[PDB]
Assembly symmetry: C3
Homo-oligomer: 206 residues x 3
């Protein structure tokens, strides 16, 4: 078995910065967003199911998914969102499980943007939340995208609140910094996680 530490945070919290810091210590990172992309790659069962359901025009000349087309085709039929999700849900679960089993690091870091929203913390052994102020989320996202404060605040309104995330966190790491202290903070967490992972299979009492 593999010890699973789930990492989550809101838009603009810099989850990648924290994940890369754990990757630097030899931890394998399994990213929910990458897995979702991997399950619709050429050859994947989901791709054929998608073409069969939405039609051949969802497939590009090279056989890959026309994501933009499908993305806009869903918006034009939210009911379709459900069929798609019901299709991909099982596949993402199986591919995620596969990649976790394949990781050889002491424990794995599973990055899940929607950890709180979809209650996926129930599938984690430990929950780490990358925390930052709402201003930081707004600032960074804008500087990385567009439409000033609006648009983004529309995103923050659609995600779980800062407080909702802290409510389910076992550990919290601040990323308002530079990250001047992320390397240090990550090192401390790593030490604890190595300990938790080496004893979790046989530990008789919590």
């Amino acid at each position: 078995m593999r010890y699973i530490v789930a990492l989550t945070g809101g838009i603009g919290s810099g989850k990648s910065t924290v994940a890369n810091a754990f990757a630097d210590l030899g931890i394998n990172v399994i990213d929910a967003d990458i897995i979702a992309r991997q399950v619709v790659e050429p050859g994947a069962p989901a791709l054929h199911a998608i073409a069969d359901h939405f039609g051949a025009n969802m497939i590009a000349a090279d056989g890959t998914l026309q994501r933009r087309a499908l993305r806009e085709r869903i918006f034009a039929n939210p009911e379709e969102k459900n069929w798609l999700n019901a299709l991909l849900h099982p596949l993402i679960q199986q591919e995620t499980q596969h990649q976790i089993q394949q990781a050889t690091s002491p424990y794995v870091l599973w990055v899940v943007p929607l950890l709180v929203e979809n209650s996926l913390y129930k599938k984690a052994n430990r929950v780490l939340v990358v925390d930052v102020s709402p201003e930081t989320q707004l600032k960074r996202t804008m500087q990385r995208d567009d439409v000033t404060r609006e648009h983004v605040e529309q995103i923050l309104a659609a995600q779980a609140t800062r407080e909702a995330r802290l409510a389910v966190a076992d550990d919290v790491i601040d990323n308002n910094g530079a990250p001047d202290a992320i390397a240090s903070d990550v090192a401390r967490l790593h030490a604890h996680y190595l300990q938790l992972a080496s004893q979790f299979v046989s530990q008789e009492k919590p």
Copy 2:
């Protein structure tokens, strides 16, 4: 952005008594029930457009989402009080910055509901059986306000809470 304090409680907890005390202090109250009705009003978009309930959900949820969001942006108070009867049941606390639970004994829930709605004790117990439990609400509460007594007895707690919420609302966006 606007700070959201969610208010919830079981049937007979007197949620309105508490919400009106905040309303009197100048806080805009956004009522989930009021909004649910507004979404299905005369000439509403929803009207123009087992099982069938789910189809009806994919329709009413987004609209309810947008309307709630609209009332929150037009509110003029430092923070808003979002009254959500099914906060625990529907996990809507994940959308709140703070959770206030109006708490009472099951005895109070029974006595008040039977009185106000003139119904049997076995009838209200059925309702209590269908809503989250007292302890389930307490598990997600940031703040708890006892409402077992008369309306005037909550004054002290409302004043402490309102001052705390004003402070949280003023600092939350930049709070490191």
Copy 3:
């Protein structure tokens, strides 16, 4: 109104051993899996509805449900599973409520294997988790069924983690050993649950 103490635990935690210990102390045990069986017993309208929907072969010559036959008809088939849940979920809810209402013990022990997975703890006044190490879950499951360690890890991955259960538990009882080892803990919990049951209806403050 009866006080409801929900009991849960992962596969191999020996949930029924704990439940039986409380039953021996005079507590009415309300088991979700037993309730599901009761609602499809001979004479129940749900049984006839199942035969009408899936076929007469769903019923045995002695009038009882052919359990594996039904499972085979819903396995893989999402629509048939949905249909069966739509039929049974309400009946199970009603029967459970009914048996809780008629129980004679001050508090009941509601045994729910999927308590955390399905957020059913929201309907309990107290949550008792039967806790065991993952190692215990693996060994017991491997001995019970003719399965491999990996087969069991797949099951474990489909259930909430040990930590997720502990996060919502009010009380925890260790069941890594033999049945007698829990007698003392069950007696202590029992005494406390009678106290909570005696005060909960009129308790003014939490």
